[PDB]
Every structure is written in C-alpha cells, then in structure tokens.
Amino acid sequence: FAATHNPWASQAGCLSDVLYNTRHRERLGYNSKFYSPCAQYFNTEEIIA
Amino acid sequence: METHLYSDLAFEARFADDEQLPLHLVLDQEVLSNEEAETLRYVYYRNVDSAGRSTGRAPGGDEDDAPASDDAEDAVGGDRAFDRERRTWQRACFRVLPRPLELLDYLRQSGLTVTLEKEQRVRMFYAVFTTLGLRCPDNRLSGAQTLHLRLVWPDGSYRDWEFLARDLLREEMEANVARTDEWKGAGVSRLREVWDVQHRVRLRVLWYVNSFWRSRELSYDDHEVELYRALDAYRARIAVEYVLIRAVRDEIYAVLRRDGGALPQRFACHVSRNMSWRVVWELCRHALALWMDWADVRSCIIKALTPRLSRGAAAAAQRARRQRERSAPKPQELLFGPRNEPAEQTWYADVVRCVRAQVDLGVEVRAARCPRTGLWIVRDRRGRLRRWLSQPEVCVLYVTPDLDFYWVLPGGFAVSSRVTLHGLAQRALRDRFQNFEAVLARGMHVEAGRQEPETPRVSGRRLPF
Amino acid sequence: TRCLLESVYTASAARAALQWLDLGPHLLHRRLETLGCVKTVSLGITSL
Amino acid sequence: VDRWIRHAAGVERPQLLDTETISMLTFGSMSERNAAATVHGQKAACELI
Amino acid sequence: GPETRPGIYVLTSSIAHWQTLVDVARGKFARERCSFVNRRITRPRQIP
Amino acid sequence: SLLHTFWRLPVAVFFEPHEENVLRCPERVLRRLLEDAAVTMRGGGWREDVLMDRVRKRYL
Amino acid sequence: SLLHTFWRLPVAVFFEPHEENVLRCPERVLRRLLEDAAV
C-alpha cells in the first residue's frame, strides 16, 4: 500500500523501463536471441494488451 | 439606426474604465463594394495618439524600438508581438442594410427625425452602420490623434483606412421615461462627410444630439507641432514597405557589384549560342528602373512576409530548424522506430515587362526542383507550366518562404541574394500588415481544422428574413 | 499506395530487407534473383 | 576512456562490426560463444538498480 | 544526380525475340538511358 | 518520288541547363553605364514624397 | 558579352511546348525591339 518500492525502476521512462522494456530496447539495438529475464515483467504494452 | 442606440448606451456604460467617445459612422459604395459588403464579417478600430503609436501597448514608450535584424527563427520579435497587436485592436458594433435607400428618407421612415440646415440628396446603394471610439485620455482631446479602421472579410483579407481628428470635427467641434424614446424623438443633429488621410475614401459621420458626450464638457485643441508629430508617425507607417523595397533595390545593386555580374544559372530554361545578350542586359536595367517606378505594397515580398509574422510560422521555423539540424540516421531508429519524411515550394512573384510597360504584382507560383538537374523550375498554381522565361521582353522577380531571393532575366539566369530588413524597426512592420486570425462568429465551427459550410451572407438579393 | 502498404509490413526482417537495398545499384542488380511463384502456405511462426 | 573501460571490465570490443552486421544484429543473432567447460550448467542471471 | 532509387515493372508483352524487345525497351525508356549518360558525364572516374 | 514536302522535326541546336553555365557580363562598359544610374538613383525620388506632399498640400 | 556554357557541343531538342520555349525571336525582332526600347 506504499506508492512504489523502487522509484528508479517503475515509471514509464525511468532507467529500467528504457533498459529492459523491449519497446524501448528496440530503439537501442539488442541481440534478439538473448534472454534477459526482466523482459517478462517490463513488457507493459504486452501486459496491458 | 439600431446599433447606434446600443453602442451609444454601451459607451455610456464603459466610460469609467475606458474613456472613448461614441463616434457613429455610416459608409457607402464609395468605400467598399457590394460583394465586399454583403459578406463583411466584423469591423475593427484602434486609434493612434499624437506621441504614442497605439493604446494597447505601454503608455510611455515600448520595447518595439528594436529591429528584427534579419533573424531566422523569431521572425519579428517572436510571437509576443502577435498577441500584443491583437490586444490593441478592438471589435466594434456592426450592421449592413444591403438594399437601396435614401438616408434622410430612411431615418424619417424609421423612428428618428432629421433636422438639417438643408435637405440635400445622398443617393447610396447600401448602408453599413458602425460606431467607433475616439479616445479622450483626459477631458482634453487632441487634434492629431488619428483613428484607424479595418474591414475584415471571411477569407482573412482586409483593407485599411485611417483618418485624423481635424476632419472628423472640422465643424461639430467649432459649433459648440426611457432613454431610447427620447433618443428616437430628438434624434440626429446633422450629417457631414469625412475623408481619410490620403483623400481616398469618402464616408459620412452621424452626430446625434442626444449623445451623452455632449454632457461631458470635453475640451479640445489642435496644435501645429502635434500635427507634425502625427505627420511623421504617418510618414513612418507609409514608409515601411517602401524602405523594404529600397533595401531590395540596393541589395540587388550590391550583389551585382560584388561578383561583378558573372552570375550563374538558377532556373530551368534553355539557351541558344547565337542570341546576343547586350539587348537583354539593357532590358534588365530598364525593367529594374520600371519596377522601381511601379513599386507598391501589394507585391511579392510583402505577401511573402505576411504569413511569416504569425505564430504558426514561428512553430514551423523551430521544427524545420530542428529537422534540418539532425544527425546521420542510425539503424536502430530505421529498423523499429517511426521513420522520417517539403514537397514543393510556395513562392511569390513579380513579373515586369519592358516592351509594354506593364508590371503584374500579385502573383502566386509553385516552384519545383527539377529531378535531372539542380535547377529550379516554376509551375502555375493550377499545374500548367509558366512560359514567361521564354519571352525576351520580360523579367521576373521571385521570393521564397525562406525569404531568399531570385531576380530572373530571360534565359533562367537568376541574380541570387537575400532580403534585408535590418534597417527597419518592429512596430510599423507589425501594425501595417500583421496577419489576422479569425474569431468565432456565425457560420463557423468550434474546433479548428474543420470543413466550412457556406457563409451567412446577409443578402441584398434574397429575402433576408 | 506506398504509404498504404508501408503501414502493413511493420516487422524486423522486412525493414531489414529495405535497409539491405541501401547500397550501390550495379550490385543491386546482382542481389536479386528470381525464385519463382508460391501456391500454398501454412501460417505458423516459420511458415512452409 | 572507452578502451580503458573495456580493459577494466574484461569484455572486449565489437572488433569493428561492419555496416551489414549492424543490421544483422538488429535482426538478431548469437554472439557469445560457449566457455571452456560447464560442470554446473547453463548460466543465467540479470541485474536491476 | 543525388538519388539512385529505382523502379520495378512487369511487362506483359507479346514480343518473343529478345532483340526486338530491347528495341521497344530503348524506345520507351529514353529518359532512363538519358539519365544514365547524364550521370556518366556529370560524375566521371566512377563506375555505373 | 519527286520533290515532296513532309513533316520533319524542327532541328535547332540548343543547350540543356547546368549548374556552372555562366552568363558573363561586360564589366568595363555595362557596369560603367550602370554606375551613373546607381549613383543618380540614390539621391532623391524615394517615392515617399509625392503622396505626403499632396496630403500636406491639401492642408496648407 | 557572350555567355560561357558548360556543354560545349549543342544539343538537338524534341521541341516540346510542354517544356519552356527558348528565346525564339530572330535578329529582325531583336533590332526592332532595340528601336522600340530606344523610341
């Protein structure tokens, strides 16, 4: 019932939501064969879709 | 008759916070056309003081004594000048009776009573009724305070008339139940014509004897040095476009002096080896002198500068500079992001012809860059090609929305330069031809960017109902 | 039509092919070689 | 300073990825080779600030 | 001059013999060969 | 098969436009005929005195 | 007085009126226009 227990990894356009989110990892250049296990948590567009 | 009563009472109302007098006016066919008055949207006015050049700006001085200095992004002092010059223009009451009428007989058939010294005949075809306000700052009124007056049409086009205070009050200042029924009963004192400054427009002023302005005990004086300062203010407000034209002329002469005249080809028209060019050079000199003779505010560079002054040109200049200042594209944005994209230009032109001594001033031309070469090729606004670059008896000037420059002699050879407005201040360049944006009235939608229906068109042929 | 079908090939390898027609034209002749026509599909991740 | 960071962290340079391999890695491929021997198993972990 | 981006066509012609097809091709692509020789004159020491 | 007349194309040697095809100007004669016009059109005749002297003439 | 063109050898044209025409007054019309600009 707090606001956010990690304010550097939550907002739409923070460090991790441009680092691990694939919709903003696409504009940085990534090997698509790799598995980074934050991808299943930070795909917010996929989650809300 | 109707809007005179309302605006007279409303100027009785608002005298505490804005100190103007009710100056009722009528106009005729001697000023604006029947097609131009049938669809007339709304009238405007703002009076110029003797020492101050406006009312809406600061009372003592302004910031408008700085030149634009040929800037790129901020066109004329940014966009604060746009809202500033919009703030000083006031909207006035308005009505058009679009049918033939005799003014004395119309006011006699209506409720009022005319009491003239003599019943002359004013035969006019359509009467537009409006009231403007000459402002008394103190009780004293100045005989050099001039009153400007706009006529705004639905497309966005306007004409400009203005007139002093000597010709408004040349006689009527030297001759010194409800309110509506006594106003109807006593009524109008007399009628006289008033001229503009340049003696072009003859319109008529109506002096009502039941005006409350007669009960304010206004004082008046018309000095010579105040009239001379008004003469210099009007000198500047007329000399703005003409000093822009002289800046263009010595710009062309200096850029001919600079490289000597061995000028390249910038337009797509062929040439032949055999034809002499001494004749077309003498034609260039004669036609440039002819363009110096027939110079006018209705020209290419002024209409190229008219959409430059608004805020949309500032936003488009900022975004176009941000787009043209953009680095080499990276594959990361090419492969997943939104891709990027100025199809054909929108120029203006003056076409001057030496053999017939007829220049043609207001021309629109869509230019294009030819794909095979690096040359410019002009085209009409419909889509046909422009064949005046064939005629050896003509010349043509060009101007970009970037405000670049091309003076083109026959053969597609163009004297390239840039326009110079360093020598011009800000306030005349604003209040001469600031492009005005329409306000909401009858017939137009609420949100911008919509398809428009037909005009209201208060009509003289149909039954108006 | 180009801004019609540009908005329907939003993928990786399609825009990679468009970026792989970027180089010189004399070799752009040599890159393409016709494979023929196609009748049936299977509509998987790797359609056959 | 980039050669310093690559020397300090341990991982090497791209070894001059050409203009086609940039869009090839944007298409997605395998770059990290296997290690000498895996007694334990296939490694995986990640990171979040 | 600057750009080199091509055009793709499909020709459903009834002509069989190939030289009699390149005759019609040179008849109907005169702008393209004229642009080719314009590029050959305007940028020498290159290879189109 | 005699001397007949047909529609040949009108052959005319022309020049397609370029970026460095210059129209050279005679300096020492035509610029020195432009010199006196440039120095005589600076002083006076600004086209800012005619309508202003008319609106001052109606006043005085 | 005469100009300097790049392509030294002149070109035959299709003479499209769809393009711009090329300064097609002969020497008689040039001399006549010289007299008209004179008088």
Torsion of CA F6, F12, F16, F17, to 10 degrees: -130
- The C-alpha angle with vertex C35 and arms to C33 and C41, in degrees rounded to 5, equals 140
With H, G, I as helix, E, B as strand and everything else as coil, classify residue G11.
strand
Tell me the C-alpha distance between C30 and B411, whole Å: 43
Cβ-based neighbour number of residue B133 at 10 Å: 20
Q: Do E4 and C26 lie within an 8 Å CB cutoff?
A: no
Amino acid present at B429: L
Of F47, A35, E3, the closest CA to residue B374 belongs to E3
Contact B443, B455 (CB under 8 A): yes
Interface contact C2, partner E, CB < 8 A? no
Tell me the C-alpha distance between B216 and G13, whole Å: 82
CA B290 to chain centre: 25
Task: Give the gap in angstroms from C-alpha B425 to the nearest C-alpha of chain F.
Answer: 17
Query: Using alpha carbons only, how large is chain E's radius of gyration in Å?
Result: 14
Tell me the C-alpha distance between E36 and E44, whole Å: 12
Residue numbers in B near A26 (CB within 8 A): 332, 335-337
With H, G, I as helix, E, B as strand and everything else as coil, classify residue B404.
strand
Chain B residues bordering chain E (beta-carbon distance below 8 Å):
372-374
Interface contact B279, partner C, CB < 8 A? no
Return all residues near B35 (Cβ < 8 A) that are at least 6 apart: none
Q: Do G12 and F14 lie within an 8 Å CB cutoff?
A: yes
Return all residues near B37 (Cβ < 8 A) that are at least 6 apart: B27, B96, B98, B126, B128
> Which residues 334-353 of B are in CB contact (within 8 Å) with C?
334-336
Q: Do A29 and B331 lie within an 8 Å CB cutoff?
A: yes
The helix (run of H) or strand (run of E) holding residue B106 is helix B103-109
Interface contact A36, partner D, CB < 8 A? yes
Could you identify the residue written with the tokens 């004329």? B76
The helix (run of H) or strand (run of E) holding residue B235 is helix B224-259
Q: Pick D46's closest partner by Cβ from A8, A33, A38.
A: A38
Task: Give the gap in angstroms from C-alpha D20 to the nearest C-alpha of chain B.
Answer: 10
Q: Do B336 and C15 lie within an 8 Å CB cutoff?
A: yes
Tell me the C-alpha distance between A26 and A11, whole Å: 18
Task: Give the gap in angstroms from C-alpha E30 to the nearest C-alpha of chain C.
Answer: 19
Query: Using alpha carbons only, how large is chain D's radius of gyration in Å?
Result: 15
Residue by residue, DSSP assigns B442-454 as TT--SSSS-----
Contact B66, B425 (CB under 8 A): yes
Of B159, B304, B305, B302, the closest CA to residue B241 belongs to B302
Torsion of CA B290, B291, B297, B302, to 10 degrees: 180
The helix (run of H) or strand (run of E) holding residue B243 is helix B224-259
What's the distance, Cα to Cα, between the start and end of chain F in Å? 88
Interface contact C34, partner E, CB < 8 A? no
> Which residues 18-47 of C are in CB contact (within 8 Å) with D?
19-20
Q: Which two tokens stand for residue A36?
A: 């980074």
Q: What is the resolution of this structure in A?
A: 4.0
Tell me the C-alpha distance between B94 and E44, whole Å: 71
G6: nearest CA partner in chain F:
F21
DSSP state of B271: B
Residue numbers in B near F33 (CB within 8 A): 285
Q: Do A33 and D26 lie within an 8 Å CB cutoff?
A: no
CA B73 to chain centre: 23
Tell me the C-alpha distance between B75 and B317, whole Å: 9
- Chain B / chain D CB contacts < 8 angstroms: 7
Tell me the C-alpha distance between B406 and B403, whole Å: 10
Interface contact B335, partner A, CB < 8 A? yes
Q: How many CA atoms lie within 13 A of B32 on its CB side?
A: 26
Tell me the C-alpha distance between B136 and B142, whole Å: 8
Q: Which two tokens stand for residue B59?
A: 């009372």
Residue numbers in B near A28 (CB within 8 A): 332
> Which residues 311-340 of B are in CB contact (within 8 Å) with D?
331-332, 335-336
Of F6, A2, F20, the closest CA to residue B262 belongs to F20
Tell me the C-alpha distance between B321 and B341, whole Å: 14
Q: Do C28 and E48 lie within an 8 Å CB cutoff?
A: no
Beta bridge partners of B158: B152
| A-E interface (Cβ pairs under 8 Å ≥ 3) | no
Interface contact G6, partner F, CB < 8 A? yes
Amino acid present at B350: D
CA E20 to chain centre: 16
Residue B330, φ and ψ in degrees, nearest 5: -100, 150
Residue by residue, DSSP assigns F1-60 as --S---------EEB---SS-BB---IIIIIHHHHHHHHHTTSS--SSSHHHHHHHHTT-
Interface contact G20, partner B, CB < 8 A? yes
Q: Which two tokens stand for residue B81?
A: 């000048």
Residue numbers in G near F9 (CB within 8 A): 14-15
Task: Give the gap in angstroms from C-alpha B158 to the nearest C-alpha of chain E.
Answer: 44
Q: Which two tokens stand for residue B26?
A: 């009528």
Return all residues near F12 (Cβ < 8 A) that are at least 6 apart: B272, G12, G13, G15, G22
In order of A16, A31, B6, D12, the CA distances from D5 in angstroms are: 22, 21, 81, 10
Tell me the C-alpha distance between B212 and B24, whole Å: 13
DSSP state of B306: T
Long-range contacts of B83-87 (CB under 8 A, 24+ apart): B84/B56, B84/B57, B84/B430, B85/B56, B85/B430, B85/B431, B85/B434, B86/B436, B86/B437, B87/B56
Contact B84, B57 (CB under 8 A): yes
Q: Do B335 and A28 lie within an 8 Å CB cutoff?
A: no
Interface contact C44, partner E, CB < 8 A? no
Contact B411, G23 (CB under 8 A): yes
Task: Give the gap in angstroms from C-alpha B337 to the nearest C-alpha of chain A.
Answer: 7
Cβ-based neighbour number of residue B56 at 10 Å: 12
With H, G, I as helix, E, B as strand and everything else as coil, classify residue A23.
helix
Contact B366, B347 (CB under 8 A): yes
Long-range contacts of B2-9 (CB under 8 A, 24+ apart): B2/B95, B2/B129, B3/B93, B3/B94, B3/B95, B3/B129, B3/B130, B3/B131, B4/B129, B4/B131, B4/B206, B4/B208, B5/B180, B5/B183, B6/B93, B7/B92, B7/B93, B7/B131, B8/B131, B8/B183, B8/B208, B8/B211, B8/B212, B9/B179
Torsion of CA B51, B57, B60, B61, to 10 degrees: -80
Q: Do F14 and B272 lie within an 8 Å CB cutoff?
A: yes
Q: Do C12 and D23 lie within an 8 Å CB cutoff?
A: no
Tell me the C-alpha distance between B7 and B25, whole Å: 11
Tell me the C-alpha distance between B363 and B350, whole Å: 6
Could you identify the residue written with the tokens 């299977």? C42
E4: nearest CA partner in chain C:
C25
Beta bridge partners of B141: B220
Residue by residue, DSSP assigns B143-198 as TT-EEEEEEE-TTS-EEEEEE-STTTSTTTTTT---HHHHHHHH-EEEEEEEE-SS
B293: nearest CA partner in chain F:
F47
In order of B198, B409, F50, F56, F60, the CA distances from F53 in angstroms are: 10, 35, 5, 5, 10
F21: nearest CA partner in chain G:
G5
Tell me the C-alpha distance between B91 and B133, whole Å: 10
Tell me the C-alpha distance between B457 and B153, whole Å: 11
Return all residues near A42 (Cβ < 8 A) that are at least 6 apart: A16, A17, A20, A21, A22
Contact B147, B134 (CB under 8 A): yes
Task: Give the gap in angstroms from C-alpha G3 to the nearest C-alpha of chain B.
Answer: 8
Interface contact A32, partner B, CB < 8 A? no
Residue B202, φ and ψ in degrees, nearest 5: -105, 105
Interface contact G16, partner B, CB < 8 A? no
CA B325 to chain centre: 35
